[PDB]
Design an enzyme around this catalytic site. Structure first.
Site, PDB file in Angstrom:
ATOM      1  N   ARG A  20       0.806  -1.231   0.000  1.00 50.00           N
ATOM      2  CA  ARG A  20       0.000   0.000   0.000  1.00 50.00           C
ATOM      3  C   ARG A  20       0.848   1.295   0.000  1.00 50.00           C
ATOM      4  O   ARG A  20       0.375   2.364   0.386  1.00 50.00           O
ATOM      5  CB  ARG A  20      -1.080  -0.037   1.107  1.00 50.00           C
ATOM      6  CG  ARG A  20      -0.585   0.218   2.528  1.00 50.00           C
ATOM      7  CD  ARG A  20      -1.509  -0.403   3.595  1.00 50.00           C
ATOM      8  NE  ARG A  20      -1.137   0.014   4.958  1.00 50.00           N
ATOM      9  CZ  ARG A  20      -0.009  -0.337   5.590  1.00 50.00           C
ATOM     10  NH1 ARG A  20       0.892  -1.113   4.997  1.00 50.00           N
ATOM     11  NH2 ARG A  20       0.227   0.097   6.825  1.00 50.00           N
ATOM     12  N   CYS A 171      -1.955  13.945 -38.339  1.00 50.61           N
ATOM     13  CA  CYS A 171      -2.165  13.116 -39.502  1.00 50.61           C
ATOM     14  C   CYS A 171      -1.885  13.941 -40.754  1.00 50.61           C
ATOM     15  O   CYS A 171      -1.223  13.467 -41.671  1.00 50.61           O
ATOM     16  CB  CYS A 171      -3.600  12.584 -39.498  1.00 50.61           C
ATOM     17  SG  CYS A 171      -3.863  11.183 -40.623  1.00 50.61           S
ATOM     18  N   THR A 173       0.153  16.579 -41.282  1.00 47.42           N
ATOM     19  CA  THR A 173       1.570  16.788 -41.580  1.00 47.42           C
ATOM     20  C   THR A 173       2.165  15.600 -42.344  1.00 47.42           C
ATOM     21  O   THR A 173       2.806  15.788 -43.373  1.00 47.42           O
ATOM     22  CB  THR A 173       2.409  17.051 -40.300  1.00 47.42           C
ATOM     23  OG1 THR A 173       1.852  18.151 -39.577  1.00 47.42           O
ATOM     24  CG2 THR A 173       3.814  17.383 -40.670  1.00 47.42           C
ATOM     25  N   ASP A 200       4.762  15.467 -26.934  1.00 46.71           N
ATOM     26  CA  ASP A 200       3.571  16.136 -27.474  1.00 46.71           C
ATOM     27  C   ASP A 200       3.120  15.438 -28.754  1.00 46.71           C
ATOM     28  O   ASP A 200       3.534  15.788 -29.854  1.00 46.71           O
ATOM     29  CB  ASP A 200       3.878  17.630 -27.720  1.00 46.71           C
ATOM     30  CG  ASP A 200       2.695  18.402 -28.335  1.00 46.71           C
ATOM     31  OD1 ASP A 200       1.517  17.996 -28.142  1.00 46.71           O
ATOM     32  OD2 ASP A 200       2.954  19.427 -29.005  1.00 46.71           O
ATOM     33  N   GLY A 250     -14.462  28.295 -36.146  1.00 45.27           N
ATOM     34  CA  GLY A 250     -13.031  28.616 -36.239  1.00 45.27           C
ATOM     35  C   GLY A 250     -12.203  27.583 -35.471  1.00 45.27           C
ATOM     36  O   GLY A 250     -12.562  27.188 -34.356  1.00 45.27           O
ATOM     37  N   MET A 251     -11.114  27.121 -36.073  1.00 40.99           N
ATOM     38  CA  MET A 251     -10.267  26.132 -35.423  1.00 40.99           C
ATOM     39  C   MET A 251      -8.837  26.626 -35.558  1.00 40.99           C
ATOM     40  O   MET A 251      -8.117  26.172 -36.436  1.00 40.99           O
ATOM     41  CB  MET A 251     -10.424  24.767 -36.107  1.00 40.99           C
ATOM     42  CG  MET A 251     -11.835  24.153 -36.005  1.00 40.99           C
ATOM     43  SD  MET A 251     -11.972  23.020 -34.623  1.00 40.99           S
ATOM     44  CE  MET A 251     -11.296  21.554 -35.352  1.00 40.99           C
ATOM     45  N   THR A 299       4.498   0.846 -10.154  1.00 41.62           N
ATOM     46  CA  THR A 299       4.498  -0.405  -9.362  1.00 41.62           C
ATOM     47  C   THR A 299       5.038  -1.602 -10.183  1.00 41.62           C
ATOM     48  O   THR A 299       5.942  -2.321  -9.729  1.00 41.62           O
ATOM     49  CB  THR A 299       3.108  -0.684  -8.784  1.00 41.62           C
ATOM     50  OG1 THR A 299       2.709   0.411  -7.950  1.00 41.62           O
ATOM     51  CG2 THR A 299       3.097  -1.964  -7.932  1.00 41.62           C
TER      52      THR A 299
END
Length: 323
Positions: A20, A171, A173, A200, A250-251, A299
Site C-alpha cells: 500500500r 495526420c 503533416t 507532445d 473557427g479552429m 508499481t
C-alpha cells in the site's frame, strides 16, 4: 527501425516497495524551474485550454498551457483568470514579442514558443530575444523531432523542449509532407539533450503516458484525451437524438498548422462546416484514470519515481499480433 507507443510493451521488474506504498508521480525539469505532482500539461490548442482548463489541471496537481490564438488583451485577461502556474504561448513575429512582453508585465512566468518546425534560424532568433526579454523565466520551445533539434533549441536558450512533429499525431503533416518521427524514437532521441523533454503527440491512453515518461520525457502534453470535456472552450449542445456535443467553427490551432502545410491558399473554396466533438463526461475521472495508470505502471516497474522509471527502462518490441 523507428517505434511508436503501440510498438512496445514495458517489462515488469522487481518491486521492493510495500503493497500500500504511497507512489510519487512528481516530476521536476532538468533545470529546476518546473515541478508538477502530476507531470501532464493540457495542450495549447484553442479547442483545449483557456483559463477553465488551466484551473482544472492546476486543481489536479497538473498544469495548463494557454493557446496563443487570442488578441493580446484577451490573452492578458485570460492569463489573469488562471489560478496557479500556467504556460502562456507565443509565436515568432514582432507582434508575438509584444505579446510576450505584455504577458511578462502582467505577471506570467512560464512561456511556450510553439511552432511547426522549431529547428530553424528564425525560431532560434525568437528564443534569443525572449531569453533577453524574460530574464530567468521558464521558456518551453517546440516542436522538434530529433536530438539535433532539441540541442539546437537548448543552445538558443530554451529551458524545456517539446518533441513531436506529426509522425505519431498530426495526420495532416504526414499526409501532406511525408515528414514525422514515431513518438518513442523521437522522445528517446530528443531526451539525449541536456534539458527536459515534453512529449507532445500520439498519446491515447494512460499506458502511452507511462511509456512516454519511461522513454525519457519528463512531462507529457495531452489534447485528445481531454477534447470535448467540460473545462474545454465552447458551449455544450444537446441535439435531437439526446447526445451532447461541443461544436467548433473557427479552429485556430488546426488552421495555423494547415497554413504551415501550404493548404490555406486562394483555391481552398469549399464552404466552411462546423466541427463536432462528442461531449466527454467526467473530466475528473479521465485524470483519476491517468493518475491510477501511472502509479500502477510505477508499481510494475518497481520504481520509486519517474527518474527511476527512466533509469530502469526495459521494453520489448511487439508485432500487430502482440496486440
Amino acid at each position: 527501425q523507428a517505434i511508436t507507443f503501440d510498438d512496445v510493451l514495458l517489462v515488469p521488474s522487481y518491486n521492493h516497495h510495500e503493497s500500500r506504498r504511497v507512489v510519487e508521480t512528481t516530476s521536476t525539469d532538468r533545470l529546476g524551474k518546473l515541478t508538477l505532482n502530476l507531470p501532464v500539461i493540457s495542450a495549447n490548442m484553442d479547442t483545449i485550454t483557456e483559463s477553465n482548463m488551466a484551473n482544472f489541471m492546476h486543481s489536479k496537481g497538473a498544469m495548463g498551457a494557454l493557446h496563443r490564438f487570442m488578441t493580446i488583451e484577451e490573452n492578458i485577461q485570460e492569463f489573469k483568470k488562471c489560478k496557479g502556474p500556467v504556460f502562456v504561448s507565443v509565436g515568432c513575429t514582432e507582434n508575438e514579442l509584444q505579446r510576450a512582453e505584455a504577458l511578462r508585465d502582467a505577471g506570467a512566468d512560464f512561456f511556450c514558443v510553439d511552432v511547426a518546425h522549431a529547428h530553424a534560424k528564425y525560431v532560434g532568433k525568437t528564443l534569443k530575444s525572449l531569453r533577453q526579454l524574460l530574464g530567468s523565466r521558464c521558456i518551453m520551445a517546440g516542436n522538434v523531432a530529433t536530438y539535433a533539434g532539441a540541442d539546437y533549441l537548448a543552445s538558443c536558450g530554451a529551458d524545456i523542449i517539446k518533441a513531436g512533429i506529426g509522425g505519431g499525431s498530426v495526420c495532416s503533416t504526414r499526409i501532406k509532407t511525408g515528414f514525422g518521427v514515431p513518438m518513442l524514437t523521437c522522445i528517446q532521441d530528443c531526451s539525449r539533450a541536456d534539458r527536459s523533454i515534453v512529449a507532445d503527440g500520439g498519446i491515447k491512453t494512460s499506458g502511452d503516458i507511462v511509456k512516454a515518461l519511461a522513454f525519457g520525457a519528463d512531462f507529457v502534453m495531452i489534447g485528445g484525451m481531454l477534447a470535448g470535456s467540460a473545462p474545454t472552450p465552447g458551449e455544450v449542445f444537446q441535439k435531437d437524438d439526446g447526445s451532447k456535443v461541443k461544436r467548433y467553427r473557427g479552429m485556430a490551432s488546426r488552421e495555423a498548422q494547415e497554413a504551415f502545410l501550404g493548404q490555406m491558399h486562394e483555391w481552398k473554396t469549399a464552404e466552411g462546416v462546423a466541427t463536432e466533438v462528442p461531449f466527454k463526461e467526467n473530466p475528473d475521472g479521465i485524470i483519476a484514470d491517468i493518475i491510477g495508470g501511472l502509479r500502477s505502471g510505477l508499481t510494475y516497474a518497481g520504481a520509486d519515481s519517474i527518474s527511476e522509471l527512466q533509469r530502469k527502462l526495459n521494453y520489448v518490441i511487439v508485432t500487430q499480433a502482440g496486440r
